[PDB]
Amino acid sequence: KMVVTLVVVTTILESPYVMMKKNHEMLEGNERY
């Protein structure tokens, strides 16, 4: 075929600031918290 030619945000689990979700093991990304 055609061949070519050549922000880290840290935190800690504290209520009510950052808490675990219900389906935290069933979801991924930034929606886990």
On whether the CB atoms of residues 20 and 33 are closer than 8 A, the answer is: yes
Q: For the chain, give the residues followed by a break (C–N over 2.5 Å).
A: 6
1-33: burial string, b at 16+ Cβ within 10 Å, e else? eeeeeeeeeeeeeeeeeeeeeeeeeeeeeeeee
Q: Please give the structure tokens belonging to residue 33.
A: 């918290």
Rounded-to-integer distance, Cα 29 and Cα 33, Å: 9
Phi and psi (nearest 5°) for 30? -80, -5
Q: Give the method of determination.
A: cryo-EM
Structure tokens at 2: 């055609």
d(C-alpha 18, C-alpha 11), whole Å? 8
